[PDB]
């Protein structure tokens, strides 16, 4: 036997839902490049360390 | 030189006059824009949804097909008006 929403909450819910959906898409977009670049430059660093131990074994 | 600088001071007074003339025309635009200091009422939502359903009624049976052109032209132009705001939101994006 469903119990009708005290409408305050039925309002408060789905709004916040879509707020969070937007927040998530925004975070994804805003964050991808920084991590991509930090990791790629760390890859430069690790290749350099590899060649270091190659010449400084 | 200094006279040109003095002319610039007069120009500054002229610029103040330019602001002075713009403000009443802007105030008339403000009178049209002063209707809402908070988001629109959810009171007429019923009227709008009911008008929408009445449009659907006029559509389903094929009765709106007795209209004249000018009316449909107007309707479509305001439809495209509403539409441009979608790209406007994209702009915000």
């Amino acid at each position: 036997p469903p119990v009708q929403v005290s409408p305050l909450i039925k309002l408060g819910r789905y709004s916040a839902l879509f707020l969070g959906v937007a927040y998530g898409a925004k975070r994804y977009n805003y964050l991808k490049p920084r991590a991509e670049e930090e990791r790629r430059i760390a890859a430069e660093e690790k290749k350099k360390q590899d060649e270091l131990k190659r010449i400084e074994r | 030189a200094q006279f040109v600088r003095n002319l610039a001071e007069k120009a500054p007074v002229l610029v103040n006059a330019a602001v002075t003339y713009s403000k009443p025309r802007l105030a008339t635009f403000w009178h049209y824009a002063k209707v809402e200091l908070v988001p629109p009422t959810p009171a007429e939502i019923p009227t709008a949804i009911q008008s929408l359903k009445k449009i659907v009624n006029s559509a389903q049976t094929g009765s709106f097909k007795q209209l004249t052109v000018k009316e449909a032209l107007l309707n479509g132009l305001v439809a495209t008006e509403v539409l441009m705001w979608f790209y406007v939101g994209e702009i915000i994006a």
Partner: protein, 83 residues
């Protein structure tokens, strides 16, 4: 009370009625271009105090004409790719 009316007067249901009551022969094409030119002329030009707007329209029209003519050769330098 009339078969032929201003295309704005006619309705959508009888839309094809108007489309079929009217003629299409090139003579009836000149006899349309003329009506357009003369409406413009006798409404915005042939008046004792004609203004800029009595002329500026055809200029800013020719402009858009020759812009459309050129659209092809301008898709090659859009500053942004994904529009």
């Amino acid at each position: 009370p009339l078969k032929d009316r201003r295309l704005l007067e006619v309705k959508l249901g009888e839309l094809p009625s108007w489309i079929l009551m009217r003629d299409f022969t090139p003579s009836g094409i000149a006899g349309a271009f003329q009506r357009g030119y003369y409406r413009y002329y006798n409404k915005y030009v042939n008046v004792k105090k004609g203004s800029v707007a009595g002329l500026s329209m055809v200029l800013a029209a020719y402009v858009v004409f020759n812009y459309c003519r050129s659209y092809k050769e301008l898709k090659h330098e859009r500053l942004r790719k994904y529009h």
